[PDB]
Amino acid sequence: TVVVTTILESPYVMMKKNHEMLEGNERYEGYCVDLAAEIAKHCGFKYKLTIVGDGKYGARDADTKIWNGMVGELVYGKADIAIAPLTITYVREEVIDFSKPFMSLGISIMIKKGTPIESAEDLSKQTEIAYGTLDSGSTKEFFRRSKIAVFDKMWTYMRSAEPSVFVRTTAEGVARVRKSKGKYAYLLESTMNEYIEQRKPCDTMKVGGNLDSKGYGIATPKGSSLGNAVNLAVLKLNEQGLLDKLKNKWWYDKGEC
Numbered sequence: 001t002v003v004v005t006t007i008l009e010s011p012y013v014m015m016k017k018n019h020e021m022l023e024g025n026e027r028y029e030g031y032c033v034d035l036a037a038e039i040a041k042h043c044g045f046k047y048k049l050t051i052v053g054d055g056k057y058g059a060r061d062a063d064t065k066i067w068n069g070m071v072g073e074l075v076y077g078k079a080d081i082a083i084a085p086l087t088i089t090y091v092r093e094e095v096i097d098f099s100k101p102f103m104s105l106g107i108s109i110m111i112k113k114g115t116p117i118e119s120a121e122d123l124s125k126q127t128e129i130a131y132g133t134l135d136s137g138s139t140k141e142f143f144r145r146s147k148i149a150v151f152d153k154m155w156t157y158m159r160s161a162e163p164s165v166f167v168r169t170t171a172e173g174v175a176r177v178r179k180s181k182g183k184y185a186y187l188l189e190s191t192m193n194e195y196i197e198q199r200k201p202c203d204t205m206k207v208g209g210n211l212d213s214k215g216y217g218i219a220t221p222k223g224s225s226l227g228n229a230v231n232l233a234v235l236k237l238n239e240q241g242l243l244d245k246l247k248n249k250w251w252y253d254k255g256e257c
């Protein structure tokens with residue numbers, strides 16, 4: 001039985017309100033829950049869904065060189081495959097294999113409805129409306145290392161802005177936009193930005209185009225016998241229109257706005 005590590009992030013993987021009554025993979029529902037079943041069918045294997053221990057994605061500590069999150073659980077042999085919204089990145093692909101992307105995304109701007117901002121440039125040309133990112137991770141580094149005039153101007157601003165414009169978690173950034181009366185814009189992944197746009201009280205919105213291009217991939221350890229079939233199944237699913245169907249289902253059909 002294939003051990004599948006995943007993370008509790010809406011609407012990818014959630015607990016059914018009556019999870020105690022059920023057991024097995026029946027306790028969960030969501031985009032990745034459905035995706036897992038499909039990948040399992042097209043690769044001919046049995047699996048058990050497990051929630052990543054530390055509830056993280058996967059980063060390598062700079063001093064200890066230890067991997068945490070789902071990537072960690074793969075390189076340390078505790079899981080056979082990772083099916084979740086795990087961004088495909090260089091540092092992670094050095095230690096594990098990524099399938100072709102099953103969903104596209106990018107850094108985007110979230111604003112409280114009515115906020116007079118329509119693009120990253122709009123943000124860079126003022127200070128009345130503060131804006132920031134997660135105090136650590138991909139999106140922060142993007143601005144810190146960008147050579148682009150507008151992004152570099154945004155970085156210089158965020159660097160020294162007071163009060164600090166960085167948040168410890170994604171939920172904190174979203175709440176900050178909702179409770180700042182339009183004086184705070186949050187920079188986060190487009191997929192999460194658009195999900196939140198479809199949730200009550202429907203006071204947020206995604207504006208402007210993506211600042212970059214990324215993708216979520218399914219991960220397997222190096223040398224995994226699953227690697228090949230997983231890759232083909234993701235392509236077949238997308239070619240048959242199922243991935244787009246799956247996203248519309250969890251983002252829109254189940255939307256509240």
Ligand SMILES: O=C1N=c2cc([N+](=O)[O-])c([N+](=O)[O-])cc2=NC1=O
Pocket residue numbers: 009057058085086087137138170188189191192
């Ligand atoms: O691997 C990653 N996957 C993520 C997936 C999501 N998500 O949207 O599912 C978010 N987000 O919530 O901002 C951040 C993430 N950061 C990462 O490092």
